[PDB]
Amino acid sequence: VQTVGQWLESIGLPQYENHLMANGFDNVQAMGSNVMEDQDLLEIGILNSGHRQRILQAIQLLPKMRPIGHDGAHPTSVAEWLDSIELGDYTKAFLINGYTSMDLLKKIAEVELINVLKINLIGHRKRILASLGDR
Numbered sequence: 001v002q003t004v005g006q007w008l009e010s011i012g013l014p015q016y017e018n019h020l021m022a023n024g025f026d027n028v029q030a031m032g033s034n035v036m037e038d039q040d041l042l043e044i045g046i047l048n049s050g051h052r053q054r055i056l057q058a059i060q061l062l063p064k065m066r067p068i069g070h071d072g073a074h075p076t077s078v079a080e081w082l083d084s085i086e087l088g089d090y091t092k093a094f095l096i097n098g099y100t101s102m103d104l105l106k107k108i109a110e111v112e113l114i115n116v117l118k119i120n121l122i123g124h125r126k127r128i129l130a131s132l133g134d135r
Contacts, residue, residue, distance in 0.1 A: 002028035002029070002032075002064075004021060004025060004027070004028055007028055007062075011054060011058040011059075012055075015047070016045075020123075023044050023045075024123015027086060027123075029086070030127055032064060034126065034130050035059045035062065036056070036059045036126075038052060040122050040126065041056065043122055044122060073131070078090075078091055078094045078099050078102075078105070081102060081105075081131070082094070084131070085127050085131045087124065087127070097116050102132075106134065113125075
C-alpha cells in the first residue's frame, strides 16, 4: 500500500502532505502510471526552490514501472468510468454537463474541463487526464 505521507516522508518530511492531499494528490496511485510533473508539483505550492528537483527525480526514480503492469479499464459510461478513478460524485457534474459518451470526454480541452467540470484540482485533474489519455 503506497501512501503520499509515507513516500513524501521518505523523500523528505511530512510538510507538503496536507497540500498534496487537499490538492487531490492524496493517493500515490495518481503518479503510478504517470510520474508527477514540474508544472504540477510547482502548481501545488512547494515551500521554496531546492525541493522541486527532489520530488521530480524521486517520483521519477520510483521503481514502480513493470512490463506486466499493462492492465487497463473498459467502462461503459461516465459512471463506471470514474468508478475506476477513485471518483464517483463527479458522475453528477459530468452528467448534468452533458457527458454521456466517453468520446465526448475526448472532445474538450483543459480550459473546457476546468470551466465545465470545474475541478480545479491537480489530483483529480491528472487522474482523469491520465484515465482518458488526451496526449
